[PDB]
Design a protein around this motif. Structure first.
Motif, mmCIF file in Angstrom:
data_model
loop_
_atom_site.group_PDB
_atom_site.id
_atom_site.type_symbol
_atom_site.label_atom_id
_atom_site.label_comp_id
_atom_site.label_asym_id
_atom_site.label_seq_id
_atom_site.Cartn_x
_atom_site.Cartn_y
_atom_site.Cartn_z
ATOM 1 N N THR C 27 0.976 -1.171 -0.081
ATOM 2 C CA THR C 27 0.002 -0.027 -0.019
ATOM 3 C C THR C 27 0.843 1.159 -0.082
ATOM 4 O O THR C 27 0.183 2.422 -0.185
ATOM 5 C CB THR C 27 -1.016 0.077 1.255
ATOM 6 N N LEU C 34 10.811 3.374 5.029
ATOM 7 C CA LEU C 34 12.245 3.441 4.089
ATOM 8 C C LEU C 34 12.683 4.716 3.768
ATOM 9 O O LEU C 34 13.704 5.149 4.137
ATOM 10 C CB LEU C 34 11.941 2.396 3.145
ATOM 11 N N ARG C 140 6.826 -6.171 11.618
ATOM 12 C CA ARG C 140 5.449 -5.952 11.011
ATOM 13 C C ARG C 140 4.741 -6.179 12.383
ATOM 14 O O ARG C 140 4.979 -7.194 13.167
ATOM 15 C CB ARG C 140 4.976 -6.823 9.939
#
Ligand code: AMP
Ligand code: AMP
Ligand code: AMP
Ligand code: AMP
Ligand code: F6P
Ligand code: F6P
Ligand code: F6P
Ligand code: F6P
Lengths: 337, 337, 337, 337
Positions: C27, C34, C140
């Motif tokens: 998404t 990053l 995550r």
């Protein structure tokens, strides 16, 4: 006839200043002054190019970034110049555009030079990233009297060194001394000013005039006639191109490099011109003359005026010799009482 | 909002662009394109400021290069933009001011956007360190045929994004897209454009007019009458200030920030105008309209013109709405028949 | 391939990261993350190199600051990373070496990633200009409960991306993700990381061992026997060279490029080891395994350890597979019972 | 008792070099030499930090980027140093680690100083971004004979100025002259070296030894005994920590700043040590001594050795006085025939 061996050469400002100081057999006090000056300009270039702006915009949370408002360019530049020069133990009196009074250097760090400077000229307009610069003038102190504002009040004819730094698309330092004018380009990767033009001379005649025509309503008949002759040449030759930035350093520099004439005449509002005598006109007049141009108020030479106030103003016209002359004649044609 | 006091976090171009890509549910092809223009702008910026010039002047010994003519900025710039562009995998046709023909991208790097640009605008004037810039206009390809010069010939009304970077006293990127104009300041210490101004809008009415009056002898009667009213207001109001850098991005940019009007109409040696349509007029018009200003040729809107040639010229008048309106009125008074 | 000769175009981190995001049909939330680490690394880099130090030493006059203790690098660094991180809108929990507790991001900026980092590793040694770095590990979030310190306590095996930036003779970013390790060289002239090495793999066997032998009196018998075999090879082969910077990123990085083994086992004053698990060991282990090397504690793999505390320490031995294997063998010979 | 007025001060290398040169009443030739040297270092720092790497990687299509292979750091640094120094009209003979023969400066640019330097020391390892530097030594030419390699062959005791530049996490220049040792930090935003440490003195005793233990097999019994006493202290006090980078400048610099001992002893392979006498040992020995440390070959002082070859090697041990002494005694205890 002339002959030669083999010579590859890179001349940095620092090298140049030392050699000249050696040729001149000076104690080296002035060399320390020009050096401190070069270091001041470099620090102003980095600020003007906006390095660090991110910290002002919270990249590090802005926990400690006393920039925001407590760090304006105008003042920072004044601070940098004032400090770096006092730190040279070579100046006794400083006149800045930003200080109402003459700064009298502490007895401990007094030297014999007087420095009249404009820290960040044309700064009023950098909100729109207009070219700005730093103009400076250096006089030797003559009186044996305790340093005072008085020592700054000398005609421009008495300048020992004069010049400016242009923070344009690139940074240039133009240095003019008795022997001549030289231009140095700042290499910001290594922090060194490389002599890129040696002994600069201005074109005899240029093709560009530079003036703020919004004041046309208030221009004296001499200027009016000049300008009209520039746009509608009687000999049906090519009209002069026109360019005018609004930053003295930018306009004068272009004038020097390509030739032409710059003018910031007296007009009722600023009856004695707008540009200040001591740190704008004088230094630029001196530069112009060392390169072979002319610098006049319209009635007299700029460098011969004796100031009676450090913040005094003066009208000014400068540029290629044949053009300033062509306008001086027009002043003489209307000159009366 | 739930509760939010005096807060404002740092927004980098990269972050901004990506957010907008997600809002638009794009595949990320335009983002790679914008990302590549950014990087392109940063590399040109550095080359403009003269970082590494020492090398050219023999600091490390000019071993055996073919003179000083190694890297001509306008050409380096051309190269950089074209190459970082082809490498985005988002372009099929590239139109450059430096190239007689349109550049059709190899199918391997072929993407859907068409990019019109002027890598280094105002470069002839660079010898005197005057602010220069890069102008870009981005078109979405609207055809099924092989990409060709034709995909570039769409009116400025079909632009998806347009902007410019000004290399002045600081490097600034102004980007315009569907929603509005935003200005990013380059923090050179870190190679990042910081969002400093968002959803920018030009003043309704300004107080500066910009035109090369060295062409007064060739101006049409409306321009003439207009320039005359700014200098000597008929209603005895304060006259407009004048300023003209002679470099477009700097002139257009000063116009966006302070307001006023910029003009470059046709004369006796450029009946079609001097500024090019695809990569000079259209981008600045698009930005102007997005900022809430106007961009007209005197008789029609610049974005509505249908190009017939990629290096087509067009007169242009852009700026605050009330000033552009005033001139148009004058252009109507002198109407053609 | 159709036909492609000796060709290799420029790949910037930004371009790379975005491509990989599109391949992954993300998404774009990780990409914003990053992108933010990149910018973070660039700002720290600049602060490390001492750009602007002149100001601190009074170049523009130390007006009224609270001494020299204004910006302590490890703290500036902490600030920058945390703030540019929260601003990505991609993080919910941040664990920093400088913070006793985990930092839970405000729901407004709350995203799904958990980021473990060491903003400036090897900072105590900075007084002597030794290479320092930044280490990051990205998890995550795998829960449904409010983000908390617990979301950070996942074994290194659950990392989605990990890497580090070394501020040495040049700034380099090494990034490791699912597919492989890639190295980006920072071109400071333009604020861009250029892809210089891709899909990096450590040598199978190296010729340098790295350990602080100032602890020989406290090493276990296997480490001891191992170090002894490198110095005096039993099979009369050339001995291993020794090198130990005392700064991890520089030591681990030399190990990745040249090969060999890096070791930091427990001793008589750090039974658990000195290096921290979450933000030092795990990131370098993940990078090592992705490069094709090994990372063991002597008895178990670093990535499989289940953290019980965010500032947990762990011994580590990492490097070329054949050397790490050899030491493990020795560790088995001296097995426990 | 002591009292004082008010003094704020920023000392740049350039300022410092001029003042000292003034105090010394020198013709200014040496000042020009140190200045040229400072300019060389700055240009090497920018290359080492990789500014411009993007051009080598095709950002501008690499149409004109004679870097690739035709631009290695080792040589570029040699070139920069050689050229910048000949351009100072102050050197008559140059000995570089990169040139087999002594460079004899053209008659036109001859001065009286001899300069022995190592352009980029420890460069062999920057593929892994290890700290590197530049070491230099300056002798006055004594003979009235035409300059020759001979003039370089003087003991280190005869150095007038010696120092090094460390391209670590930041760039430092350490300058030692008769009067003492001072450390200058490079501010790369303005290109100025700011004196950050005045009159550096080394700790009497340090807690770190620095040596490449892979050669343990070939170490003479003196070193062997020393090292063992460092790791296993007989008095059951704390063992010395160990650190060793593999770049002389980095190791010696750390030694100077934190104290301890660095050693690169003679071992059969390099029976006379590996480090070269003229531009590695001598300059570092001189620096060490001006700061109050010791520098010995184990049998004699480094600065008293008379070289008979410019590329001659010499073993070397340096560091805090109490430690070098503790090892010298051990050499005396085993000293025989
Ligand atoms: N770098 C220099 N360039 C040109 N003239 C110099 C220089 N240094 C000294 N001089 C001349 O020598 C005079 C005195 O030098 P000083 O003794 O240092 O104050 C100055 O006023 C100059 O006219
Ligand atoms: N900042 C943006 N990034 C990506 N797409 C955008 C952006 N702003 C608007 N869009 C729209 O998204 C379209 C298609 O997305 P793309 O697949 O990347 O080509 C563009 O042509 C735009 O009209
Ligand atoms: N470079 C990348 N950018 C974005 N997503 C990536 C990338 N590389 C791998 N992915 C995967 O995409 C997932 C989810 O995408 P996102 O919506 O941005 O959170 C990540 O957690 C990764 O496993
Ligand atoms: N910048 C300086 N620092 C220390 N001593 C200097 C300096 N400049 C000159 N000297 C001393 O004066 C001697 C001769 O100066 P010179 O005549 O320039 O060659 C040198 O060999 C030094 O010992
Ligand atoms: O816009 P004006 O009135 O023509 O004044 C511009 C002049 O004023 C300054 O900004 C400051 O005196 C100069 O740099 C410049 O030439
Ligand atoms: O000197 P002239 O005739 O006014 O041309 C100036 C114009 O030309 C340009 O360089 C582009 O052609 C613009 O940047 C600028 O405003
Ligand atoms: O001096 P020591 O005890 O070997 O600690 C060094 C280690 O510590 C660190 O600074 C991290 O704690 C590492 O960078 C480094 O390799
Ligand atoms: O790795 P070794 O053999 O210990 O040699 C390293 C030495 O060699 C050099 O790279 C060059 O002489 C030095 O910088 C350094 O101290």
């Amino acid at each position: 006839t002339d002959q030669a061996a083999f010579d590859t050469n890179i001349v940095t400002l620092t090298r140049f200043v030392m050699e000249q100081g050696r040729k001149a057999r000076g104690t080296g006090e002035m060399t320390q002054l020009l050096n401190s000056l070069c270091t001041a300009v470099k620090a102003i270039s980095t600020a003007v190019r906006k390095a660090g702006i991110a910290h002002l915009y919270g990249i590090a949370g802005s926990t400690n970034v006393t920039g925001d408002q407590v760090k304006k360019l105008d003042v920072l530049s004044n601070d940098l110049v004032i400090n770096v020069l006092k730190s040279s133990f070579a100046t006794c009196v400083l006149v800045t555009e930003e200080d109402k009074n003459a700064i009298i250097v502490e007895p401990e760090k007094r030297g014999k030079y007087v420095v009249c400077f404009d820290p960040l000229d044309g700064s009023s307009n950098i909100d729109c990233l207009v070219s700005i610069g730093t103009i400076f003038g250096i006089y030797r102190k003559n009186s044996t009297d305790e340093p005072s504002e008085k020592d700054a009040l000398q005609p421009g004819r008495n300048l020992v060194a004069a010049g400016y730094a242009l923070y344009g698309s690139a940074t240039m330092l133009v240095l003019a001394m008795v022997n001549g004018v030289n231009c140095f380009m700042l290499d910001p990767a290594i922090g060194e000013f490389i002599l890129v033009d040696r002994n600069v001379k201005i074109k005899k005649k240029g093709s560009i005039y530079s003036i703020n025509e919004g004041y046309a309503k208030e221009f004296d008949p001499a200027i009016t006639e000049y300008i009209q002759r520039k746009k509608f040449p009687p000999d049906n030759s090519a009209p002069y191109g026109a360019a005018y930035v609004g930053s003295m350093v930018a306009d004068v520099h272009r004038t020097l490099v390509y030739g032409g004439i710059f003018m910031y005449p007296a007009n009722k509002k600023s009856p004695k011109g707008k540009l200040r005598l001591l740190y704008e006109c004088n230094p630029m007049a001196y530069v112009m003359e060392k390169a072979g141009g002319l610098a006049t108020t319209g009635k007299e030479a700029v460098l011969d005026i004796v100031p009676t106030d450090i913040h005094q103003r003066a009208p000014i016209i400068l540029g290629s010799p044949e053009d300033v002359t062509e306008l001086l004649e027009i002043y003489q044609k209307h000159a009366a009482k």
